Design a protein around this ligand. Structure first.
Ligand SMILES: CCc1c(-c2csc(CN3CCC(N)CC3)n2)[nH]c(C)c1C(C)=O
Ligand SMILES: CCc1c(-c2csc(CN3CCC(N)CC3)n2)[nH]c(C)c1C(C)=O
Length: 105
C-alpha cells in the first residue's frame, strides 16, 4: 500500500480529478469512442490507473507519480490537435499539475 510520505501526491491527484478540465483523463482512453489510439500511443495513462497504482504501493517515489502525470499530458498532445476540446484540456491540466508540483519542488 501507499507510504504516507506520498500523501501529498494522493492529494494532487484528487485535485486533478476534480478539475473542470480533467474529464478526458479520468479513465483509460476508450476504444469504444476512438480508433487507432494504442496504435500510436505506446504507454497509455489516465488518472484512475494512477489512483489505483498509488494506493496499492505501485509508486515508490513521487518522481514516478509525476512521470505518469506528465505521460497523460504528453500522450494527449501526441494524439490530439491543440485546438480540439481534449487537446485544450490537456494543456490546462499540465499547467495545473505543474503549479501544484512547484509548491513542493
Ligand atoms: C475519445 C476522445 C478522448 C477522450 C474522451 C472523450 S469522451 C471522454 C469522457 N467520457 C465521459 C463519458 C463516458 N461515457 C465516456 C468517456 N473522454 N479522452 C481522451 C484522453 C481522448 C483522446 C483521444 O485522447
Ligand atoms: C463527455 C461527453 C462526450 C464528448 C464531448 C466532447 S466535447 C463535449 C462538450 N463539452 C465541451 C466542454 C467541456 N468543458 C465539457 C464537454 N462533450 N465526446 C464523447 C464521445 C462523449 C461521450 C458521452 O462519450
Amino acid at each position: 500500500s501507499m507510504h504516507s510520505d506520498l500523501t501529498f501526491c494522493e492529494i494532487i491527484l484528487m485535485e486533478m480529478e476534480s478539475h473542470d478540465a480533467a474529464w478526458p483523463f479520468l479513465e483509460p482512453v476508450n476504444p469504444r469512442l476512438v480508433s487507432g489510439y494504442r496504435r500510436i500511443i505506446k504507454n497509455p495513462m489516465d488518472f484512475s490507473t494512477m489512483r489505483h497504482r498509488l494506493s496499492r504501493g505501485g509508486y515508490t517515489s513521487s518522481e514516478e507519480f509525476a512521470a505518469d502525470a506528465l505521460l497523460v499530458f504528453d500522450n494527449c498532445q501526441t494524439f490530439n490537435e491543440d485546438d480540439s476540446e481534449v487537446g485544450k484540456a490537456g494543456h490546462i491540466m499540465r499547467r495545473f499539475f505543474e503549479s501544484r508540483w512547484e509548491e513542493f519542488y
